[PDB]
């Protein structure tokens, strides 16, 4: 659901990069290759963690109660 | 006046709920195996 | 065989009634106890036999 | 407030004795939720 913290293997914190990642995509139109590299996710153990996340918690947030 | 709706109602329901395509009196002679329980284990499933 | 199997024994006249343990009574609800299938069959045999005695 | 049940549909509050089992009095619903406890449940961070 929500971003995981701490790339599973690598351990690096990634739970904060999510917002900025989305921002780069929308406002900067950036390409997610370069987007990731901008956030510093060098090794793919973390790049995977971000790039492939799926943010279901959005669709959870739409049930009224 | 005096039409047994319960006939159709219950007949349809029972048949669906068990899947014995036949009659509620038909236990085994009724064809079965239709109407399973919608495996919802994983969206793709 | 003479002692154990004489052909007339191949047709029943008296009938043995297996005791409850062969046909135990499941109490699958707690006020009433669904009787064993055989017991129904026995009730049926007994009913019919009663009826035949009556009709005779 | 302290709570005893929640209407499922109206998502408000409610209280009931062994009386009725239904009727979110406003919506008159028929399904109620059991109004999460207050035991300050403990959790293990792992």
């Amino acid at each position: 659901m929500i971003v995981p913290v701490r790339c599973f293997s690598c351990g690096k914190v990634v739970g904060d990069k999510w917002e900025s990642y989305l921002n780069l995509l929308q406002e900067d139109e950036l390409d997610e290759g370069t987007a990731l590299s901008r956030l510093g996710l060098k090794r793919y153990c973390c790049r995977r963690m971000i790039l492939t996340h799926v943010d279901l918690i959005e669709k959870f947030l739409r049930y009224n109660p | 006046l005096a039409i047994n709706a319960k006939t159709i109602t219950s007949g349809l329901k029972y048949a669906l709920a068990t899947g014995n395509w036949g009659e509620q009196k038909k236990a085994m002679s009724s064809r079965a195996g239709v109407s399973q329980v919608l495996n919802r284990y994983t969206y793709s499933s | 065989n003479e002692v154990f199997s004489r052909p007339e024994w191949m047709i029943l006249t008296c009938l043995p009634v297996p005791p409850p343990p062969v046909r135990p009574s499941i109490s699958f609800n707690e006020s009433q106890r669904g009787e064993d299938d055989l017991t129904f069959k026995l009730a049926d045999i007994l009913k019919a036999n009663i009826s035949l005695e009556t009709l005779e | 407030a302290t709570l005893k049940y929640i209407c499922a549909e109206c998502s408000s509050k409610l209280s009931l004795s062994r009386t009725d089992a239904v009727r979110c009095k406003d919506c008159g619903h028929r399904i109620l939720l059991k109004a999460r406890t207050k035991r300050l449940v403990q959790f293990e961070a792992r």
Binding site: - | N4, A5, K6, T7 | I26 | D26, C27, G28
Partner: protein, 234 residues
Amino acid sequence: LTCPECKVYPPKIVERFSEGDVVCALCGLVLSDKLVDTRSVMDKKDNEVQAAFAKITMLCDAAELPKIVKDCAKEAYKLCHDEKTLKGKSMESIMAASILIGCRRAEVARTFKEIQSLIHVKTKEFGKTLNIMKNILRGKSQNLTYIPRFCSHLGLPMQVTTSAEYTAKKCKEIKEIAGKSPITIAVVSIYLNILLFQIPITAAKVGQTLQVTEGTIKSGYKILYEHRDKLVDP
């Protein structure tokens, strides 16, 4: 079943069903070793009983009644099923009596007229039969439920229905010709609520729907307008 060792007259024992034993929770001795788990037409005078059963069942179908009401009526019929105090009574009067028995016992509101529309009982022999049957069952051993049925039959919302509920609740304490066959009181409370509202269900439709008097409603409404004082919740 007692502990030979501990020997307390009310034996504090436990059943360790998972082990299938029974233990003297005091001394620990096991008492019983293997615990059997169990968890998973004319020759019988039930000929008339089953005829009643079948007619009762088809009637229950027609009424769309709950299986609990069906069972209650079947049980009531089985409870009487024969008596001099019954003495015949057409075997349909008793059906209708036991049906109303089942509905009342399972808290289902049913009109004698609805039951008679189900079954030709002439309604007077039905009255006598239900009286005698009630008395028999009393030997053998709460009018609010009617409101929402008619609210539905007229297509009325739930806040309207609860307004009617509170009105009928005050009806008992508002003698000043409160009830005297309070079906009229229920219907006039409904009329009060609709007139409080702006619903085009004017008396004609409600009367022809519920088979009620077009005049007893206004007869009640006469005292109802005076009674209006004790009916404003919000």
